[PDB]
Amino acid sequence: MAEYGTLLQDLTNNITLEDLEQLKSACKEDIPSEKSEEITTGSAWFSFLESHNKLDKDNLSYIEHIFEISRRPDLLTMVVDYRTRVLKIS
Numbered sequence: 001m002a003e004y005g006t007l008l009q010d011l012t013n014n015i016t017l018e019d020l021e022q023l024k025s026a027c028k029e030d031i032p033s034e035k036s037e038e039i040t041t042g043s044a045w046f047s048f049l050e051s052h053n054k055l056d057k058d059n060l061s062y063i064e065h066i067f068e069i070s071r072r073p074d075l076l077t078m079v080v081d082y083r084t085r086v087l088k089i090s
Helices: 002-012 017-028 042-051 057-069 073-089
Strands: none
Touching: 002 042, 002 057, 002 073, 017 042, 017 057, 057 073
């Protein structure tokens, strides 16, 4: 899903360095440790969760949670929209 990857990239285009580390760690749970060191941006850990068939609603809710505790209503709105968009994409 190149479109959805781009949408997730747009999220990670508006985060802090700590947020990136949190998103990496959240996805690291499923992403192989060898690839966990290759996570530098949004499309990175996306392609890893996609390739390894690990991407799921739970991981997406972890992304939302991180943005919630980071106090970013803007990102939260984006995530929700993208969670419905990916359903239109699939």
